Each structure stands twice: as structure tokens, then as C-alpha cells.
Subunit: 253 residues, 5 copies
């Protein structure tokens, strides 16, 4: 919300990094990174999901040295090879076979901003009764199933904003860059790439990156990798942490 | 250099020569009742081609909106006319994560499993133009009897199942032009840019990307964007995301809104 | 610099040195009756290779059209030919496959109809002369029906490459797609593009946009040169199989639009 | 200073007759189990124990190769600069009436689908291959050339298994790959896609050229005025009405442009 | 300009090339089944998950000695790599051992979850541990996250390791650490699912440049280059229905140049 002047040159650069843990629901102390098992077939009139079943967006505020302009990010999902454990817990694919890989709907999303991520609410079912401890669209209507401009939120709390209720708001986020891919379907294969050679440039069309208000950088993520199928046939979301390395420079304003 | 039936001259320059407009365009999937905004009526199947009378609320339609822009041409005898020229669009489908609700209404994938994701045939389409989108009609079945309140190819013939050049329409009404009957007309739309992808099949995964970093340039090969006739910008969309499968096995289309942010500049015309 | 049996000289410039033509080319899927334009006859299956006699209406064919261009060389006192420089093309009516209420087998009890899916072939060509084809057969012993033009005097080698099987795409609804491909050993005066995707459950994936242009110039900057002021467009757009409530399957095809920009080229 | 094909590379020669083009096709070598089934393999056996795996020759697709003689020529050598290549006859797979198992009652025949391999090379000498086996104990049939004295290490990398692709219809595709530790005087390209239900995806166009020049601008140099083309185009499996499966292959077209290159003797 | 704990000066007989074929480490359950794992167990409770060593694919690594430079400072700088997976066509053997797809049909292709990964560095690859199940009891001869907690199922920064031993670091326990590896370049793709088709490309025309944004490649400490790989191609399904991982070797050709350092 400021007039942007010249990049400062000469201690004018800094780098910050974070590993941001996923918030899949964490149904007990041993099942960190998983959701509660999924319910199915609730009538739209009686759809009361349990909090531990709902993955939420992750976010962290990173303090910076006492404006900082975010210029690049390196990011990837951490622990993708853990899905090669087919011996623990997963339903056998057939008699004498190995366990079923994690697969199905997934969502991979990150943002880097100079302020909290701005979100827009959209619901599958406006009549869903969301559980205490979630932050979901207030006073939803049938219009909330399409676009209801009342549903604006800041991603200002961890393990609170359910991924199923909120998307990054393309009508705001003037001071953030976000990227997400949703792939839906029962049998969707997880496809995840890692490399330390790929950098995303955060500069806009005028060469200006996110400007860090109150010397704070905000990282946001959601990395729902797919569904884990237990021997019983029950399914749980599995998520993984996301790494960020952000390069910043001093910008005169 | 002729476009939008005017002679195109130079881009106008100076501080106030740019404007930006935005809108969220709601999907028109059929909206069978107040609870199922964003969905179609459940899908029928196996109608003989000779007795195919789909209900209106089962038929997704193209969405469109006319966005009024400032008049630029007060000075009638200056000799200089200006029109708004659309230069870029940022667009994405809104609410894609809503499909991660597998607890409400969807058939379980197997005993003790979660609900079935939305999947299957999908169509993602948008246009930005200086006039209504120009459409060409093509039917699966020329003998389909389309319901009151839809606008569909008039007096279709067997040729309407392939290319019948009689079926020209303007996308000039919301919740009227069924997506299954109409496509953007590549023989027209000289003053609009359109983009669509159809992916057909029972098990097709929805794949949707969001980012505020991606801009589509709307300039043609001569560097001219859509020119806004009557100081109007037209946005058009269809975002059928796939089929929702209820516990009963019934299927309904699910659609989502589309966001547009369009940057325009002043263009001199004769 | 030789192309289209002429020595290629300079590109001409000026307002009259460019022209544009357009065509919607209808598909030729077999058209088994007057109501099923754009479909084939239902598919037979399991014919022994020794007794494989497909019906004509079951066989999609390549489409082609000859487009007259503005007449050149109407003075006897320097030769010009039209040179095709760009094409815009797309398949027309792709959203018609969102009709899941008419005719198609339900996906499951209480469900909607089965989408068109399965093997597909999307192909076009732009040339200064008819498309040159090479014959290749699944089964050299296939007995093709009257009204089709198929490889003559085939042998087992016709299942791989038999150089006898050369044809021009010189007749509509005649050259079955399953028998012929564009000939990579010829077509020195045409540009062709095709993608075959085979399989029972292949999803049709089709894109439309008026922003995409294909350049038709070769490595020497020469486009197809239009013999006798004629441009040839060719297509095949088999979108997949339509499955009827009975389980019978029929090909579905769609028309292809072409918009071709040409310029005048001096030749000797 | 610039060394390739065991010669010092000097300047490209230009002018009248300093360029030539060769165009050819390679027929596929899928096994050809009888006179009528050119382009197919014998039906596939299944479930042989690794200790008793003796595939029949007609069941094994092999690499195709040919030596193309060039116009006879400080020495001059032909330098391969570009190749245009594509698979010939891809639309033949739209015949779903002949021989293939119906997909369901009253349905059409099952498309060819499943594991496929599409490969070509252009070189100034035979393609250099490295052997790798699924099962080192496989007993390969007379008329095939397969890794000699294989060991369990032959299932991963056994550096003993070096061969030249020096005979057509002899080197089974399942036994051999292009050797990335050699082929300094060839360019090769291949894609393997494995799986029962893999869709064949094949593109044809006469507008796509592959440049064969390396990072120093030198193409394959044709030793003894010979150009070597190699291919394998296993398109997938054909499923007969009985459920038996056979590989189907198609020919590959090549158009190669060459120029004269000066080299030191 | 600091990398590999040296000040990087100018690029400088100044070039060398090394190559390696790095064998896969899939578990090798007997003398005949080199390149395969032991058959996969399934449905172990998270509280009683004790995988056998021969069932666990591990990362491969090799230290490649380079010409000695400072005998009387220069370091080798890795500039490019050519790499590919070796023996991909071996999966066209559908006659040996694999379950028939249906009566009278050929054998089932190798398919399912796969992981293709390589790295080139001037020092061992730096790894971060992440577990499906922190309570997994890993077998003797494996090196797995020490003192695991439920946080080990997400990100536990305690789990740092060097890829400093072959056939030891299970692929399922470790990933390249994006918070380290300042002196290496790594690339990997995981594709998960029962029916995933293996898709593998070979060509001698593809080179990966290993220079960073400042034009500096990995700098080879102690005149050593480290190559690392994992190439789990998918699952082989036996006639009985049992499944085994199949892996293949990876080839590397690396071009290096001399770099002045202080």
C-alpha cells in the first residue's frame, strides 16, 4: 500500500527458509500428517464433518531483519518417497500383493506474500455444519456454492481454514504470489518433483515482488497428497510438509 | 488495418489511458432448486435419438456478462475517436478445493471408504471480446427436442450433427445457450479471443490450476486487442468441472465461477 | 530452390499480394443412414483375418476439399503462385459430447450416459496439390467394400511397408482412415499433422482457440505452392466411440475448420 | 583440436553436390510367426519360471537396422545434419473389425494397447548396445544375438554385454538398449511406456526435423561412406478373440540430410 | 562468493570427463534376483511394522576420484551431466515370471509406484528423513531416522544424514534435503499408484547444466565427485500375485573444469 521507488544495492539481500508442516487433521498423537478417516454419503441437510477429518491451510509469519521485497522462492514437498512404504497399514492390492499406494484427489498449493494470504470461500454444500475450531464462510447461502463475495478471509491462523472451504482470492492478493493445482479423482496418481535447481520469480509485470509489511514475510501451503486406504477400506488424507527458501532485497518506498 | 468494423489507428498514451475491470461470472449448470445452485438436475440416460427431450435444469449453459466502460468520445467534431482495447486477461476457476468435500452426498468409493470425487467429462472455456461471443451450433442428435427457455440451433437437420453453417448465434443471454449445442465460431469472433478445452470420459480427473502470476495477452498478430463496441466489454465462460455422483448412483454436473481481470487501454480509431 | 515442380523466386509484397480462404470440412465417418450423419455403422468384431469383409458405412474415410484461389497469370506478357503461409484450424462441435442423455449406455444403474471415448485420430493437411497417401493395413487379406479405394494387390508386406500402395486423396468418402496415412516419402508441397491415440478408455482431449496459428513455411521459408490456383485441405477427426444402450459402438467424427493465409510467390 | 569419429574435424565443404539426402524406411522385426502375420509376433507365453524361460524366436521383437551406402568421396566424410522420421501406418490400428477380442458383448474389437517402445538412431557407424536382462537365466533361441555368459549382474549393469547392432532381426529389443557410454558418432532417441492398458500415442508430421549436430556443430561422420539407421517401434499388444496377445510393430521412415565435412586423414 | 566452504574465484588441460554406471539397490533377495526386492508384505499395523532388509530399496551412491590438483588452489567444478536409466527395454520380457493379464494372455508389465532420482555433488548428498509411520522398526543394515517421533511423519529437522553408504539408506525413509545440498544438484520425480505406467526416455542428446544462478557448479572436495541415484521402476507381479520392486542402473557422464578458489 506504498509508492515503490528504487531497489537498494550494495547487506541489501537476505535469505529466509522455513519447513511448513501440513495440517491434515492429526486425529491422534501417532497420526500426525493424516486426517481422521473419511465419512461418506452424509445428506447435504445433515453434513457435520469432524474437525480432525478436515485438512486446513498451513501458514507461517517469518520475521525479517528490522521494505524487504521477496524476489524468488525455491519450494518443494518434503518426504515424497515415504509413499514407497507399502508394508505399513495399507490395504493389500490383491491376495499376496503389496499395500495400496496413496492416490486420489490431491491439492498442492503455496503462496509467498508481504501480508497474510487473502482467501475467498466456496462450498460444495452451503448447509455443511462445520465443527468448532474451524473458520468457514459465515452466513452461507446457496450462492456460497458458486461465488458469494461476502466470504473473504485472511489466512491468519494455522489448522483453522479448511482447504475444502477456501481458495486464494484472485480479486485480492496484490502483495502476494500464489500457485496451486487441484487434481481430483479416486485413482489419480500423486506426481511430485524435487530439485534444488528450480526457482520461481516473485516479481510482477513492473519488476516488484511482495513487499513485507511490518518486516514480516508470510508463507502459506496446502499439500494434500491423496488418500491412504487402510486394510479395512477406510480412507484418510495424507499430507507432507513444504520447504521454502525465499530471497529478499531492500526496496526504497 | 480494420477490426470491429473500424479503421484501427495508434494506441493513445498519457497517464489516464489505461483501466482495469474485474468480475466473477457465476456458472449456469441448470440450478434445479434453491439447494443445488452450481449443479445440474440429475442426468437421464439412454433416450432414443427419436425421443430425446432434456429438461432445462439438466443442461449447463454458457455464462456471459456485459461490462460497461467509460464513453471516450464526447468531442464529436475533434476528428479523433477512441475505443477501449482489451490487452490482457487474468482468469481462473473459483472454488476448486470445494471438490475436497468427500463427506457430503457423494457415493462411497467402496464399503467404509470416502465419497467419490467429482470426475468425468469437463469443459473449461472463456472468452473476452468487444462484442458478444459468436457461436456455431453442432448437435449430438439433431432430433433432440430442447426445452422452453433454451436457445438451440433452429430447424436442425442431420447436417446439424456435423457442420450446418445456418446455426449462428450471439451469446446474448445468460442461462440460455446450452454448452452441448454451441461452440465458439472460429469463422467469426474477429473482435474476441476465446480459449477452451474439452476432456471427455467417465473417469477423467479434473485438473485445475490457480495463480495470480499468469496473464493471457489478448493482442492479435497486428498487436490489436478486442475493441469495445458501444463502450462494452463481454466476458463469457463455461466451467463444467465433471459429474457429482450421489449415494443413489445419480449424477449431476458441477460447475464453478470464473474470475476475470482485464486490462484495457485507449486506442485511436477512424 | 525447387518446390511444386517450379524454381522458387521472391515473395511479392503489396495489398493485393495476400489472400485468405476458409473451409468447414465435414467428417466422413460412414453415415449409415440419413439421421446418423457424423457417425459410422456399428462396429463388427472378431472377424478372422481370412474372412474380414467390413461394410463401407462402418469405415471412416479421409475428407478433402479443393479451394479455388484468386486467378494468377491472366496476362501473357512472369509466373506467380499462391504460397500457403499459415493455417488456423480446430475441430468443430466438441461440446456436443456433453449430451449424455441421448442414446448412450448408462455408466451404471441410475447414472448418466457413457461419454464418447476410445481410439481417436486427429489429422489435417494443407497443400498445393492433393494429399499423397501410403497404404498400410492391419490385415492384408481384408476384403474392402465397393465404393472404398484401398491398397491394390496387397501382400503380407502391406501390413508393414509395401511401396506399391501410393494414392492421391482424390475422392471424398473413399479412402478409409484405417488403410492410409499421409506419405512421408512424398508431400513435398504440403504440410500435414496427425495424432493417433489408441485404447478402449482414451479420453477425447480437444482444444479450441482463435489465438493459435500454424506456420506452413519449410526450412527454406517456402510454403506449399498452389498448382492451378487451387489449395487442398484434408482432414480426419475420429473423436472416439459412441456406445449405445445395447453395447454397440459407432465412431463419432466432427467437422474441421480451416483458415489459410496465402501470399504471392514469383516462380519460373 | 576438434576431434569426432576418430578424426580431426575441419570445415564444412559448400557448393554444387556438397549436400545429399537419403530417404528409406525400416520395416519392423516383431517375429513374423507365419507368412500372413508380417508385423506381428508369435503369441506371448506367460508365467515361465525364471529357471525355465526359453522364448521362441518368433515371439521376440528385434531391433531393425540398415547400412545405407553414400556417394563415394585432407579427406571428406559425409556428416549427417538432420533427420525427419515417423512411424508409418499408425491409422491401421483403427481396424477394430479384424481378429481382435470384442471389448464387451456387441462391442467393437479391442484396440492395440499396452507396453510400447519407440526408438531410432542415426549414426556414422553401427549403433552400440548394452545388454540388460529381466532374467539372466533366460535361454534365448537360435537366430537371436543376446548377452553372452550372463550373470545375475546382467539384470542390472554387466559391462561385458557390449554389442554392435550389426544384423537386422537378430538383437531382441528386450535384451539390448543403446549404450550411453559409447555412440560418440551417433544420435539416438527412445521412449519406453510400460503397462497393460497404456494407450499408443503416435504423431506424424512432415514439419518436424531433428538436428543431429552436437554442441560443437558436428553431426555423425559416416565411416566408410556408410550411414546407419536403427529403429524399434513396438506399438503395443494385439488381443485375439481367444485372449492371446501378439506384439504389433510398424515401419519407420527416415529422411536424412548430409553435407560434406573436411577431416584430417 | 562462497561455495563448498571456499571463496570461488575465476574459471581456469582445464577440463576432464568421468563416467559411472551406478547399480540399483532394490534389496537383492537372493543370488538370482539382483535388481529386485523381496516380495512386498502388506497390512502391517503401524504399531508392528518390521520390514525385512531385502524388501527395502535403498539409495545408490558412488564417490568418483578425480585427477589430484594441489599436489604442490584449484578444485574440479562439475559443469554438465548426461544421465539415463539403463535397460528400460528389459521390461518387454512378458514371458518370464509375471502373472498372466488374463487367461491365454501375456505376462503383466512392471507398473505401479516409481521414483527416478539422481544427484551430482562435490560431497555426499545431504538427506532429510520423513517416514510414513514413525513407529516402523527398520532392520539391521539399514540407516533410518534416529529418535523418530510423530513429527517424523511430517518435518522433523533432527533427521539429517549424509548418503555415505550404499545399500543402507532406504528410499522410503529419506529425501534429498532442500535446506542443504549447497554443493550438489539433485532431481527426482515420484509417481505413485497401483497402475502407474513406467515412462522412461533415453537419448545421448540431452545434457543437464549443473551451474547455479552465479555460474558455479558443484565444487569437488578432496578431488571427489559424488553421484547418487534411485530408480525404482515399479512392481513386478509374480504368477502367485506377489509383488517385488524392480530397479535399473543409471549411467552418468559428467564434464568438469578447473576452478580457482581461496
Amino acid at each position: 500500500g506504498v509508492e515503490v521507488l528504487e531497489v537498494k544495492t550494495g547487506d541489501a539481500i537476505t535469505e529466509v527458509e522455513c519447513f511448513l508442516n501440513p495440517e491434515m487433521g492429526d486425529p491422534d498423537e501417532n497420526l500426525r500428517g493424516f486426517s481422521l478417516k473419511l465419512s461418506a454419503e452424509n445428506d447435504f441437510s445433515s453434513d457435520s464433518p469432524e474437525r480432525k477429518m478436515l485438512p486446513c491451510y498451513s501458514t507461517a509469519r517469518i520475521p525479517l531483519p528490522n521494505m524487504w521485497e521477496a524476489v524468488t522462492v525455491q519450494t518443494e514437498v518434503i518426504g515424497i518417497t515415504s509413499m514407497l512404504n507399502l508394508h505399513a497399514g495399507s490395504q493389500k492390492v490383491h491376495e499376496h500383493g503389496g499395500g495400496k499406494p496413496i492416490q486420489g484427489s490431491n491439492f498442492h498449493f503455496f503462496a509467498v506474500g508481504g501480508e497474510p494470504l487473502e482467501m475467498q470461500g466456496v462450498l460444495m454444500n452451503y448447509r455443511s455444519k462445520y465443527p468448532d475450531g474451524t473458520i468457514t464462510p459465515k452466513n452461507p447461502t446457496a450462492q456460497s456454492q458458486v461465488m458469494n463475495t461476502d466470504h473473504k478471509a485472511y489466512l491468519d491462523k494455522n489448522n483453522a481454514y479448511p482447504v475444502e472451504c477456501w481458495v486464494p482470492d484472485p480479486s485480492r492478493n496484490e502483495n502476494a504470489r500464489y500457485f496451486g493445482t487441484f487434481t481430483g479423482g479416486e485413482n489419480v496418481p500423486p506426481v511430485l518433483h524435487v530439485t534444488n535447481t528450480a526457482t520461481t520469480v516473485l516479481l510482477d509485470e513492473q519488476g516488484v515482488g511482495p513487499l513485507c509489511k511490518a518486516d514480516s514475510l508470510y508463507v502459506s501451503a496446502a499439500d494434500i497428497c491423496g488418500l491412504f486406504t487402510n486394510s479395512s477400506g477406510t480412507q484418510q488424507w495424507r499430507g507432507l510438509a513444504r520447504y521454502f527458501k525465499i530471497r529478499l532485497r531492500k526496496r526504497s518506498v
